[PDB]
Design a protein around this ligand. Sequence first.
Ligand SMILES: O=C(O)CO[C@@H](C(=O)O)[C@@H](OCCCCCc1ccc2ccccc2c1)C(=O)NCCCCCc1ccc2ccccc2c1
Ligand SMILES: [Mg+2]
Ligand SMILES: [Mg+2]
Length: 330
Amino acid sequence: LSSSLKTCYKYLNQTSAAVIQALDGEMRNAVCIFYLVLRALDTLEDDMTISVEKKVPLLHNFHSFLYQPDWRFMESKEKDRQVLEDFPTISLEFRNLAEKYQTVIADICRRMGIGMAEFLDKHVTSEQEWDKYCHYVAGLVGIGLSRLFSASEFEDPLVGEDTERANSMGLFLQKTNIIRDYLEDQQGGREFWPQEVWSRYVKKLGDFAKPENIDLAVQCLNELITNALHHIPDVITYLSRLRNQSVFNFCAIPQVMAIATLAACYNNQQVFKGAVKIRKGQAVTLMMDATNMPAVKAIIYQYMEEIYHRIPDSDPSSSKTRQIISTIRT
Ligand SMILES: O=C(O)CO[C@@H](C(=O)O)[C@@H](OCCCCCc1ccc2ccccc2c1)C(=O)NCCCCCc1ccc2ccccc2c1
Ligand SMILES: [Mg+2]
Ligand SMILES: [Mg+2]
């Protein structure tokens, strides 16, 4: 590997990785660079020290910067700011990619940037808006990855073309994350839980942090969880199609981790008191297990059974939670 490509894998290892590195053939570098490029865009987007005036063109034009050898950004106050400051090193390697991979990455960057710039302006209102936001920031990652798999010809064209299944992969992950991250987000001035949902419980999203609202908080939590569970049938469909082993593991691992994190957050008061995280050894076993459909399906079913037997009769979402788990299982 060249010096510039080695520096890219160094950033990958620091910002996320062996899963990406286990990818077969040309997929490995294409996904490494796709990661770093979208983490750079997100690093701009997350930076609350960048005025909306500055941020907008940065988001809209990011896809062009990939083609500008000397472009970097020196004003970030985020942790990962290295990928922006050394961006020329990443964009060099982007431009060293086969064109079929470059064009995938450029197109997704372009579309995510439009979508990100759209939401600087607003919080998520409806469940429809939550889906749109998640598509912009996560569904489009699924889409891009899927097209690399197909463009590299390690997977059937259908993987690259079925945008909804790929969308659903990114939505599951991103909703799981938003759900679990309630408090650290709240404490950082960020609101990502859809107002349409939380507003049926409390006057303000921040109210879920007060002890007196814990019952309502957990109810809302469970409703959102139940909402996230609707993506699982697509996740299963998506995973059932994958024929390359390294791609399978790449895709299955984050899904099984999200599944276990959701089950962990289900009906869990601790979501509103801190970060709920699966144990390291638990995570390691799931990663090692998630290597074929039968195994991934058993994992999904086991955690879904666990949620199912934990559903409170009085939870206002309890019949929906039961319906979706029933659908998944069958
Ligand atoms: O700043 C943070 O630490 C968290 O950011 C969240 C936010 O700002 O909303 C949010 O950022 C949104 C935009 C940046 C996306 C960067 C990314 C992530 C994973 C990748 C994996 C492979 C290739 C490229 C990748 C690019 C975020 O990072 N959420 C964590 C989970 C995102 C799911 C991405 C994803 C989607 C579908 C997938 C399908 C199959 C395999 C992996 C998949 C991975
Ligand atoms: Mg982020
Ligand atoms: Mg972001």
